[PDB]
Amino acid sequence: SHGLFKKLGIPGPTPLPFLGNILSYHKGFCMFDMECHKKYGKVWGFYDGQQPVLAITDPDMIKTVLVKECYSVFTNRRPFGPVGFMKSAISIAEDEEWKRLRSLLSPTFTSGKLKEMVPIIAQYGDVLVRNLRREAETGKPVTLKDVFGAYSMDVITSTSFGVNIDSLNNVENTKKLLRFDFLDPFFLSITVFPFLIPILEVLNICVFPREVTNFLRKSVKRMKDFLQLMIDSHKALSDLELVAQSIIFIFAGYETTSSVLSFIMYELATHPDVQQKLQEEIDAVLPNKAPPTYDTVLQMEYLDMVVNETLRLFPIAMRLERVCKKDVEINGMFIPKGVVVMIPSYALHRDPKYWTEPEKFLPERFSKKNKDNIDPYIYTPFGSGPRNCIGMRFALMNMKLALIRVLQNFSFKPCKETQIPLKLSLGGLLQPEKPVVLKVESR
Amino acid sequence: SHGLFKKLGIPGPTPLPFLGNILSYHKGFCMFDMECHKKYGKVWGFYDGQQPVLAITDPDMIKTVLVKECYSVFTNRRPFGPVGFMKSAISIAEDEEWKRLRSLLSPTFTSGKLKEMVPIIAQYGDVLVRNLRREAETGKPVTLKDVFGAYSMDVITSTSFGVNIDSLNNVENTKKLLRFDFLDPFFLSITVFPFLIPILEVLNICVFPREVTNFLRKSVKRMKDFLQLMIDSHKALSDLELVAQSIIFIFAGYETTSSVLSFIMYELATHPDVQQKLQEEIDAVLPNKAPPTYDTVLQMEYLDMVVNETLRLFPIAMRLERVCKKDVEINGMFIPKGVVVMIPSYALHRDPKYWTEPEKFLPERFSKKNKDNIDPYIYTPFGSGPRNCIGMRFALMNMKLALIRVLQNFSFKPCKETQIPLKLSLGGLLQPEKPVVLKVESR
Numbered sequence: 001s002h003g004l005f006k007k008l009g010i011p012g013p014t015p016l017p018f019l020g021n022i023l024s025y026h027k028g029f030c031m032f033d034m035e036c037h038k039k040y041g042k043v044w045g046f047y048d049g050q051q052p053v054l055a056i057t058d059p060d061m062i063k064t065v066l067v068k069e070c071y072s073v074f075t076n077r078r079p080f081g082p083v084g085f086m087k088s089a090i091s092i093a094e095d096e097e098w099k100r101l102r103s104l105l106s107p108t109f110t111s112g113k114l115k116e117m118v119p120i121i122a123q124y125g126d127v128l129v130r131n132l133r134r135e136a137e138t139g140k141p142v143t144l145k146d147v148f149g150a151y152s153m154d155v156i157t158s159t160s161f162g163v164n165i166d167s168l169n170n171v172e173n174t175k176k177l178l179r180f181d182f183l184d185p186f187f188l189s190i191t192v193f194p195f196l197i198p199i200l201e202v203l204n205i206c207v208f209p210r211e212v213t214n215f216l217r218k219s220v221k222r223m224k225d226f227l228q229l230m231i232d233s234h235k236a237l238s239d240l241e242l243v244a245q246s247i248i249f250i251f252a253g254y255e256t257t258s259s260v261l262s263f264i265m266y267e268l269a270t271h272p273d274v275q276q277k278l279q280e281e282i283d284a285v286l287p288n289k290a291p292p293t294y295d296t297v298l299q300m301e302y303l304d305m306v307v308n309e310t311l312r313l314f315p316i317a318m319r320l321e322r323v324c325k326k327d328v329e330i331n332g333m334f335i336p337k338g339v340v341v342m343i344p345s346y347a348l349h350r351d352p353k354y355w356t357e358p359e360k361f362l363p364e365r366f367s368k369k370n371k372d373n374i375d376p377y378i379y380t381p382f383g384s385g386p387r388n389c390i391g392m393r394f395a396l397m398n399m400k401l402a403l404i405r406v407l408q409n410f411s412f413k414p415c416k417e418t419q420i421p422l423k424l425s426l427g428g429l430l431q432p433e434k435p436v437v438l439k440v441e442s443r
Numbered sequence: 444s445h446g447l448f449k450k451l452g453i454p455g456p457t458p459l460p461f462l463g464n465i466l467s468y469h470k471g472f473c474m475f476d477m478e479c480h481k482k483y484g485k486v487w488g489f490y491d492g493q494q495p496v497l498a499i500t501d502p503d504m505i506k507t508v509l510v511k512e513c514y515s516v517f518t519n520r521r522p523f524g525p526v527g528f529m530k531s532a533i534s535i536a537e538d539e540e541w542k543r544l545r546s547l548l549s550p551t552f553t554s555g556k557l558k559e560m561v562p563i564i565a566q567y568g569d570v571l572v573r574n575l576r577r578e579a580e581t582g583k584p585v586t587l588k589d590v591f592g593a594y595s596m597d598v599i600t601s602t603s604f605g606v607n608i609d610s611l612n613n614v615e616n617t618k619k620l621l622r623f624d625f626l627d628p629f630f631l632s633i634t635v636f637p638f639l640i641p642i643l644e645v646l647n648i649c650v651f652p653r654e655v656t657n658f659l660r661k662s663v664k665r666m667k668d669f670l671q672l673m674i675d676s677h678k679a680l681s682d683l684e685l686v687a688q689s690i691i692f693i694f695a696g697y698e699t700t701s702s703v704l705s706f707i708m709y710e711l712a713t714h715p716d717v718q719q720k721l722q723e724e725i726d727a728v729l730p731n732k733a734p735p736t737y738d739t740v741l742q743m744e745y746l747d748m749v750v751n752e753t754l755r756l757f758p759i760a761m762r763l764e765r766v767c768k769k770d771v772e773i774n775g776m777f778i779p780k781g782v783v784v785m786i787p788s789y790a791l792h793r794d795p796k797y798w799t800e801p802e803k804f805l806p807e808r809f810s811k812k813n814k815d816n817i818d819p820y821i822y823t824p825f826g827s828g829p830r831n832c833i834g835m836r837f838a839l840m841n842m843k844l845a846l847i848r849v850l851q852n853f854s855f856k857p858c859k860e861t862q863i864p865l866k867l868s869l870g871g872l873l874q875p876e877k878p879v880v881l882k883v884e885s886r
């Protein structure tokens with residue numbers, strides 16, 4: 001299989017037997033994508049073990065894959081690995097099963113359901129503030145991912161299950177047992193030995209820990225709006241499949257939001273003029289520290305620009321991927337069946353062809369003047385098409401609500417322990433090498 | 444997975460952990476199907492390892508599976524196992540790849556191409572006769588599968604590749620290395636360890652021997668009408684995929700025809716009145732030992748009845764199977780995705796509900812009077828629907844041509860070594876326990 005791109009005339013790094021190009025992931029696959037783009041141009045191919053992967057960067061071709069030919073050709077992501085019952089999670093499911101799950105779970109994220117959650121998640125924005133004042137009087141720098149993770153977990157639990165637990169002063173199975181998720185050498189052996197995935201499945205081995213899953217399974221059992229929207233009810237949902245969607249939302253609510261929130265606060269700390277301008281917008285829109293509402297959040301243009309520019313620099317998804325279901329010929333190029341088509345979001349977000357000074361944090365990229373010159377298929381922090389991020393609206397609103405409440409009360413500065421410039425971890429996930437610590441001063 | 448049929452309300456034999464019901468194959472799976480039909484009625488379910496299999500016997504439901512819902516639900520047979528490049532063989536391919544192969548190879552078996560082969564395969568019918576006279580003068584009984592296999596291999600090679608080799612006096616890679624195909628304990632371990640199939644594939648392990656495949660690969664290479672119909676040319680064929688179809692046809696030409704021919708000659712030997720009546724029809728239609736033609740073969744009604752009644756007693760395919768592609772509800776019954784739907788041809792052919800005295804060889808079942816009372820979905824020796832036997836017309840013509848030439852010259856009788864009644868082998872394939880030996884006397 002390692003002669004595919006050579007026969008297609010498609011350039012790429014020469015693969016090694018068995019391993020493919022996975023050894024070039026020593027720099028992390030975000031640096032691999034950037035170097036491959038620089039060296040091979042618009043399109044290139046490489047191998048994850050034996051799996052051929054075709055990387056595309058042309059906006060026309062990206063839109064054809066993500067949007068135009070989603071249902072007919074590019075329906076599914078690359079198979080997850082040994083999952084067990086998590087095969088029914090929406091982000092893992094394939095074909096008509098995903099179509100049903102996407103249709104059944106879409107009502108959860110409507111702007112009507114979104115407006116209902118804002119009074120619920122503003123109560124934790126005040127607990128988050130009080131928790132911040134505790135360490136603000138301490139005088140020593142704060143670890144943001146701890147307090148933001150507690151906030152994000154509190155928000156996702158109550159909005160999903162209606163359970164209200166202050167995480168910082170306590171909460172274990174969730175959060176404390178949701179974090180885990182290591183960069184094991186097991187995942188590397190999965191791509192080198194993908195033929196072993198059916199072995200681990202029959203041994204009831206899964207990447208998820210069996211004790212937390214059975215906790216949620218029995219947690220939702222004694223639980224007898226997202227939890228309501230599935231219960232009150234294509235085809236009706238199942239009990240064990242009920243739990244699968246909860247794990248995704250919990251992980252997406254906790255891990256994603258709190259990681260991006262820490263990146264934003266880092267950028268605000270290292271750019272005080274941006275922090276001051278954002279604080280001035282918040283005080284103008286919400287005079288006298290008025291509580292943020294659904295409609296006031298949507299009125300803050302500079303807040304939207306700061307969130308967007310941070311998601312440009314740190315697209316936590318790093319890559320978009322779709323499995324080619326059949327032989328196709330897109331935009332003048334032929335894709336054989338079984339090839340994983342990959343869009344390197346991280347490299348595209350930092351490409352000098354579309355971004356001026358791409359490494360610099362400049363929110364004015366997303367101003368109403370310059371936003372029209374931004375291609376929606378180069379800048380894809382939430383993906384695109386029918387399989388984009390279903391919680392995009394919730395994530396943006398959840399992050400902005402936390403940012404407003406936090407900046408109304410505090411200003412953030414670098415401390416002696418702050419890593420400047422921030423160094424990204426090379427172990428897969430888009431996270432800082434050192435945890436982000438910042439000085440917090442009450443306004 | 445072993446609780447599926449219990450939750451469906453579908454009866455069946457209680458499966459063992461890991462193994463399923465495969466231990467009940469000690470009697471051979473043809474006896475297993477007959478006993479299950481007798482015990483559980485119209486429908487039942489069992490497990491090949493972890494694989495659930497649903498057996499159906501209602502003619503309405505069979506027609507829905509084989510004919511009505513072939514392209515939408517029941518397109519593919521159960522996956523073959525470790526195949527290697529033989530995954531592109533038409534009888535193994537799935538979905539649109541099978542559709543292309545079925546469309547590209549259908550012109551091989553037209554009645555026009557069939558009429559062209561009759562003058563070609565009549566030359567071996569005369570070599571077969573001369574070979575038979577040699578052992579007829581010997582005076583000792585003859586092993587039919589040897590002389591019929593040589594004939595069938597000669598016919599399939601010349602009709603497929605245009606190569607003309609007298610097999611009996613010689614031919615090795617083909618035939619002598621085509622037979623092999625043992626009832627290994629490896630196939631049993633395949634169903635118990637179906638998760639290991641991707642392991643054997645990556646180790647370049649296949650059920651087919653690697654030396655014969657590369658012989659045909661290089662045989663057809665120096666070969667630079669079936670071989671012509673693919674070369675002279677949906678999507679064009681491939682070199683390594685060229686060889687895959689040749690292996691199927693060679694195996695189907697050799698193994699299938701010669702096994703059924705031996706069953707027919709056994710029945711003729713143990714029913715002299717049937718043999719005499721058939722000989723009288725052949726002498727009436729072809730006076731003075733006239734060579735059989737395409738049109739004279741189709742005129743022999745009693746010849747057709749004898750072939751059909753033998754295929755009722757010995758349907759060498761034993762089972763028809765289709766993988767359920769999606770959740771469906773057929774004829775008032777719900778089939779979940781991934782269940783193998785199986786039609787037990789052997790048991791249906793010997794069911795007292797449709798056949799009087801089912802164990803008895805009675806060609807008058809298929810007379811023009813009684814043939815109308817035969818359901819085409821109970822009697823399915825060549826399958827049915829778009830995925831039936833593509834070589835049905837060729838096989839029937841090839842067998843009848845051999846039978847005519849053989850019975851014009853010889854009469855067949857049991858000898859002291861003849862096994863009466865014939866005992867079927869319990870090791871999977873529908874073949875006699877003892878090889879069929881018969882006394883051959885020149886007319």
Ligand code: HEM
Pocket residue numbers: 066090091092102248249250252253256257260311315316317320321380381382383384385386387388389390391392394395396
């Ligand atoms: C800053 C926060 C987030 C970012 C940047 C983000 C980004 C993404 C991206 C890029 C995808 C893949 C899109 C594609 O393949 O085209 C995705 C998928 C998904 N996200 Fe998010 N996401 C975020 C937060 C969330 C949240 C808070 C939730 C739920 C509470 C969520 C639920 C999902 C689901 C269910 C999918 C899979 C959808 C499907 O396969 O149909 N995400 N996300």
Ligand code: HEM
Pocket residue numbers: 509533534535545691692693695696699700703754758759760763764823824825826827828829830831832833834835837838839
């Ligand atoms: C007495 C002789 C034969 C019998 C009883 C027989 C029976 C069958 C049956 C029952 C099937 C499966 C049908 C289904 O699944 O519905 C089949 C498939 C097939 N047979 Fe035969 N067959 C015979 C001879 C031959 C010959 C001589 C050839 C070629 C030279 C051949 C080529 C094929 C092929 C290619 C398939 C698979 C077709 C597909 O999957 O589309 N068969 N046969």
